[PDB]
Ligand binder design. Structure first.
Ligand SMILES: O=P(O)(O)O[C@H]1[C@H](OP(=O)(O)O)[C@@H](OP(=O)(O)O)[C@H](OP(=O)(O)O)[C@@H](OP(=O)(O)O)[C@H]1OP(=O)(O)O
Ligand SMILES: [Mg+2]
Ligand SMILES: [Mg+2]
Ligand SMILES: [Mg+2]
Ligand SMILES: [Mg+2]
Ligand SMILES: [Mg+2]
Ligand SMILES: [Zn+2]
Ligand SMILES: [Zn+2]
Ligand SMILES: [Zn+2]
Lengths: 48, 261, 193, 182, 193
RNA sequence: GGAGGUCAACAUCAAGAACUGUGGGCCUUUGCCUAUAGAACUUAUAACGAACAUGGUUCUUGCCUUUUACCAGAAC
RNA sequence: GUUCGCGAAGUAACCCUUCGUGGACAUUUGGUCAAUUUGAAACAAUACAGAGAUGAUCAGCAGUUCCCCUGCAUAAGGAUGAACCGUUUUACAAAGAGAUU
RNA sequence: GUAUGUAUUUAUUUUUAGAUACUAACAC
């Protein structure tokens, strides 16, 4: 069917972006893989 | 055909007769933006419709017919339409053919051309969901009959049957004596929508019986969307129906899938 | 429409654009109903316009006169201080009024020479020029304000709102940066747990 | 950028038989019927002159996750309601693949943002004792019809007509208990 | 749109609040076109929003500078004569209308009622013979091939005798000081310094 | 084809006292030197406007409980 | 409906009218939206409650939150804006002494 | 001469004297 895409001129008075409305969202954190966290006391506590 | 097809639709209400906007004094002062009332809260605002339809009497051809529009005039469903044959939308009760035309687009939106919402509504309100095809209307506030008590429930049952019966092809009806509710079920989603918008806020008994001329003081009957049926019987019945229909469309899947190869 | 849309139906506007409460207000009302300089400023401004447009109306009704008119709009444009109350919401406008008084005196002496102390007058060019240029000034200012008022009215106020350090909350922030900075060190000296 | 870049998803069905089509693109339209977040909207008309107008309801994300059509909200391939295709699939295997959806708000508003791709998507006067549409249909073709009554709790009820009813008496009984009502 | 309570207005209402941002501009364009005393009624080009959201006056007044000064000074003299003349000069009351009276509709009251003569001046037949005719026209010279560009009305051109008459009329508003050297320490650069 | 328009779009309008094109020579396109043609609008008591408003940041003040609203000078 | 033209008829003497026909001129608007109860403004009123640090009365600034409101605001207010003021168990071991298999 | 907060469901979803007292926009 093809297509042709065309913008519509807004009535300048009416709000442009009819749906832009401040709302807050919690995004998920999508973890695909794990990043290995790779690193290399006794009397010490008496000091610390 | 002889009834509806030939005879062009007749204006239900003169435009001067239509109700005014600005419903009356639910509060202290009027409000321009939202159309409601300002301070204080008057006793809850609901009222019987001054209007109703008359399926064979009013319904007739209109401009949508020649223009091939899909969607039905709701002001007709309320019998309040003032545009008569000039109306842009169809005036007549939904049949199987026209639902045949809507069938592609009946999924997202009702027969009146209004998008459905996802979750229904807290109280099972106006328009349904596009998740679940629901053909079953809850009839409540049966005191739309006002205060007349009746010889039996066959009064209520019989009367309701004769009400909705006009509006479309009914699969079943059950009135409940204990808690006042009818449950009415249709062939088609479309007729359910149409009937819901048609019979909301309406009265009962005869064009004249007893208190008839005082009917307009009544509250009017809720027609809402109905929940599932908890009893095991109809639950079996649904499960089976879903089964056999799933089976039926598997035929399509394998016919066009067979054409896919 | 902007008043009711905000939900306040108990503030009445008259037809001279004075905004009065129609009721005694609970405190919550007085908080909801304090309107900013955007609205009020624009209200005062229209009130000026309506005022003049009215004088010309009463001329066309025949109710007035030719000369009484010109004296009229002269009287307006000079006495805006007294007739409006725009001077409340931008105090800067007090410059124009001072200007529009001075012209008055300069104009009167040439006009009034040899004849009279009375009201007869009606050379309104200069004052008109002043008010007009002042109005050039606040076009962008009101576009900005009322732009924010209405975009906030449809779209809700911003959720982020970071807030800068100023004279009042400084010491608090200084405390805060400090306690953090000590947390880092004393966590990084310790051996482990 | 993020919202525009994915192109729309439209069925071939509802998009009509026209060779070339003109569709409008609004960069912030209504929110989804589902996720309740803004997106980019598309008009079009099937016919050039067709009065009716088609408006994509859901997101691109909220669609892609479910693998459906934005105008139809039918499955992208089989043209099936979502609540069905997952039942067919659920018939194979045993019990699964139901699409669990998002009450509250930021449950859903949250949910649309993950890349999960969804459970469903991955595979893709005569008294007669012992519905009403069937009775009225069969009795409708053989004579005059006025009203029917059945109480399924009682499993029996009236059939009333306005002679022709005796024409019905040929096939009515035992098909079914049918007698002449009082 | 005066009465709107219907649902059909739900966009137009949104449309109103939007225009609230552009109003002060419309107040400017309206108010710089004031009709001036010698004119009875200006007629302007407005540009309106199709839903009746707001109405701009789209024009800018252009006036030949010498002619404009002549006009305005003629009115000046007429003002003085009239203030000397009549004993009781009655300054109209402010505001013109009371708060409860809705602004009367122009299409009814005003449009039928005839304009009631403006300032002008008696002029003179003999002396001003050149400028007597066109001096008080709304736009002084519109159709002339020689005297002005066109109806677009920029780039005026005149003759000597006209400029002599305009130069005559404008004496009360004319600069009058014929040499530079009079301003000695009053020029700009002496003020900056 | 001529006159216009309270019509539009696209160019251009603050700088070595200042623009552009072209011919020729050197370096190796830029750039320098030389030759030639045309330069609308705006500029010397300096500028598109013979007119004149507002805002932001930063300093200095002025009112002076604090914030908006402000006092009156400067620079950007 | 205008104009170019052709043919027929009539008035006519190539003109005036009627008729028929060829060609040119002119070429796809609008809607995200349908007109009161069932797709959604909060206020107010009534009842109950009754304002942080403290022994007690009073200024306040912040900080965290999927709470925001008034404000043009990245000033500032909204009780120091509100909520917070509670529930609370395992990276678990080592040594010694007594009872049972 | 208390912000502020909580609740405001009506229309019927299938099977004998008084002391020690606490407090009171009530009286310097
Ligand atoms: O201050 P005053 O000595 O009374 O001067 C007044 C006064 O002018 P100012 O108030 O500007 O100084 C009047 O104005 P208001 O009393 O209304 O403020 C003004 O009358 P208008 O207001 O009608 O102009 C009047 O004008 P006039 O000179 O015609 O009397 C003028 O008089 P003097 O300046 O001559 O005293
Ligand atoms: Mg403070
Ligand atoms: Mg605060
Ligand atoms: Mg406190
Ligand atoms: Mg406080
Ligand atoms: Mg706080
Ligand atoms: Zn209709
Ligand atoms: Zn979505
Ligand atoms: Zn589709």
């Amino acid at each position: 069917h093809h297509i042709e895409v065309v913008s519509k001129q807004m009535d300048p008075l009416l709000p442009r972006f009819v749906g832009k409305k401040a709302r807050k969202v919690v995004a998920p954190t999508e973890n695909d893989e794990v990043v290995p966290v790779l690193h290399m006391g006794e009397a010490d506590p008496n000091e610390w | 055909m002889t009834s509806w097809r030939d005879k062009s639709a007749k204006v239900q209400v003169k435009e001067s007769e239509l109700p005014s906007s600005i419903p009356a004094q639910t509060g202290l002062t009027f409000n321009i933006w939202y159309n409601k009332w300002s301070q204080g809260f008057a006793g809850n605002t609901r009222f019987v419709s001054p209007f109703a339809l008359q399926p064979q009497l009013h319904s007739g051809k209109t401009r949508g017919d020649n223009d091939g529009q899909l969607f039905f005039c709701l002001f007709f469903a309320k019998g309040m339409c003032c545009l008569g044959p000039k109306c842009e939308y169809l005036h007549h009760i939904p049949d199987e053919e026209d639902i045949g035309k809507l069938a592609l687009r009946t999924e997202v939106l009702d027969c009146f051309g209004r998008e459905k919402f996802a979750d229904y509504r807290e109280d099972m309100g106006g328009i349904g969901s596009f998740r679940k095809k629901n053909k079953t209307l809850y009839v409540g506030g049966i005191d739309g009959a006002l205060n007349s008590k009746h010889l039996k429930p066959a009064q209520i049952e019989s009367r309701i049957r004769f009400v909705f019966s006009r509006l479309g092809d009914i699969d079943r009806i059950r009135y409940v004596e204990s808690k006042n509710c009818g449950f009415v079920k249709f062939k088609y989603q479309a007729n359910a929508e149409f009937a819901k918008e048609a019979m909301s806020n309406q009265t009962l008994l005869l064009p004249s019986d007893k208190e008839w001329d005082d009917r307009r003081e009544g509250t009017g009957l809720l027609v809402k969307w109905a929940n599932e049926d908890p009893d095991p019987a109809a639950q079996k019945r649904l499960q089976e129906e879903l089964k056999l229909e799933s089976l039926n469309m598997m035929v399509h899947l394998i016919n066009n899938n067979t054409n896919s190869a | 429409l902007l008043i009711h849309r905000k939900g306040l139906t108990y503030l009445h506007l008259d037809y001279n654009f004075n905004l009065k409460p129609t009721k005694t207000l609970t405190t919550k009302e007085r908080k909801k109903s304090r309107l900013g300089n955007s609205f009020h400023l624009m209200r005062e401004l229209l009130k000026m316009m309506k005022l003049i447009v009215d004088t010309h109306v009463q001329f066309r009704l025949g109710n007035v006169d030719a000369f009484q008119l010109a004296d009229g709009i002269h009287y307006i444009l000079n006495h805006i201080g007294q007739l409006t109350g725009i001077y409340r919401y931008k105090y800067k406008v007090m410059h124009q009024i001072r200007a529009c008084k001075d012209l008055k005196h300069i104009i009167y002496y040439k006009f009034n020479k040899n004849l009279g102390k009375g009201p007869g007058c009606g050379f309104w060019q200069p004052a008109w020029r002043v008010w007009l240029n002042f109005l050039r000034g606040t076009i962008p200012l009101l576009e900005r304000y009322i732009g924010n008022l209405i975009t906030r009215q449809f779209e809700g106020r911003s959720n982020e709102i970071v807030k800068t350090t100023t004279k009042q909350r400084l010491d608090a922030y200084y405390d805060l940066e400090l306690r953090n900075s000590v947390m880092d060190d004393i966590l990084e000296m310790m051996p482990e747990s | 950028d993020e919202i525009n870049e994915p192109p729309p998803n439209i069925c071939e069905q509802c998009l009509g038989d026209e060779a070339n089509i003109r569709m409008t693109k609004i960069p912030q339209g209504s929110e989804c019927k589902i996720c309740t977040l803004p997106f980019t909207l598309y008009h079009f008309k099937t016919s050039k002159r067709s009065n009716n107008i088609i408006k994509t309801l859901i997101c691109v994300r909220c669609a892609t996750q479910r693998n459906i059509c934005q105008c139809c909200m039918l499955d992208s391939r089989w043209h099936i309601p979502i609540q069905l295709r997952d039942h067919l699939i659920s018939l194979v295997n045993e019990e699964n693949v139901m699409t669990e959806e998002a009450k509250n708000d930021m449950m859903k508003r949250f949910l649309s943002l993950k890349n999960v791709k969804l459970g469903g998507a991955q595979i893709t006067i005569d008294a007669s004792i012992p519905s009403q549409l069937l009775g009225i249909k069969k009795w409708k073709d053989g004579n005059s019809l006025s009203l029917i009554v059945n109480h399924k709790a009682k499993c029996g009820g009236l059939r009333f007509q306005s002679s022709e009813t005796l024409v019905t008496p040929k096939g009515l009984k035992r098909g079914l208990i049918d007698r002449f009502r009082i | 749109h005066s009465d709107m309570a219907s649902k059909m207005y739900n966009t137009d209402k949104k449309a109103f609040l939007g225009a609230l941002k552009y109003l002060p501009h419309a107040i400017l364009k309206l108010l710089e076109n004031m009709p001036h005393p010698w004119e009875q009624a200006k007629e302007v080009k407005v540009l309106y929003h199709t839903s009746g959201a707001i109405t701009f006056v789209n024009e800018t007044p252009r006036v030949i500078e010498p002619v404009y000064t002549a006009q305005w000074s003629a009115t000046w003299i007429a003002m003085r004569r009239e203030k000397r003349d009549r004993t009781h000069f009655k300054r109209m009351r402010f505001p013109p209308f009371d708060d409860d009276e809705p602004p009367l509709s122009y299409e009814q009251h005003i449009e039928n009622i005839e304009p009631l003569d403006p300032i002008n001046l008696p002029l003179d037949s003999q002396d001003d013979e050149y400028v007597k005719d066109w001096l008080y026209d709304s736009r002084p010279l519109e159709e002339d091939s020689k005297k002005v560009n066109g109806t677009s009305y920029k780039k005026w051109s005149f003759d000597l005798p006209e400029m002599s008459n305009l130069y005559r009329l404008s004496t009360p508003l004319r600069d009058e000081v014929t040499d530079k050297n009079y301003y000695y320490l009053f020029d700009k650069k002496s003020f900056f310094n």
